[PDB]
Design a protein around this ligand. Structure first.
Ligand SMILES: Cn1c(=O)ccc2cc(N)ccc21
Length: 123
């Protein structure tokens, strides 16, 4: 139906916008600490601690499959990256501090992304 096509166009446009947002957020992680899943070979106890791992590569996979239906779902995964790190790692670590900086700088981007999703009407 034409209606389903129109909805698919909206999703495609949302995916385009979120791809831009993802690129901007990842630029706030120049150390690439959050680029890939935490290695279960190198951190074998990780899943005992963290029940829902997340990372930028995993987000990108879901994004390209158009698996984010709204900005809230995207934000949930971004928050997982930050929140998982701030639990597993102590305050005095380069990991925890990288997460704090990513959260703070990312907030700016996500603030204007919300305005754009609402304005253009991509949900
Ligand atoms: C425990 N942990 C994190 O929480 C986030 C990123 C990370 C990266 C490496 N290379 C090793 C461990 C890590």
């Amino acid at each position: 139906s034409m209606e389903q096509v129109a909805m698919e166009l909206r999703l495609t446009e949302l995916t385009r916008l979120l791809r831009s947002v993802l690129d901007q957020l990842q630029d706030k992680d120049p150390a690439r600490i959050f680029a890939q899943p935490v290695s279960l070979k190198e951190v074998p106890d990780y899943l005992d601690h963290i029940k829902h791992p997340m990372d930028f590569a995993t987000m990108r996979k879901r994004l390209e499959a158009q698996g984010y239906k709204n900005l809230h779902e995207f934000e949930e995964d971004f928050d997982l990256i930050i929140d998982n790190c701030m639990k597993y790692n102590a305050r005095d670590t380069v990991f925890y501090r990288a997460a704090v900086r990513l959260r703070d700088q990312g907030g700016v981007v996500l603030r204007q992304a919300r305005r754009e999703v609402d304005s253009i009407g991509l949900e």
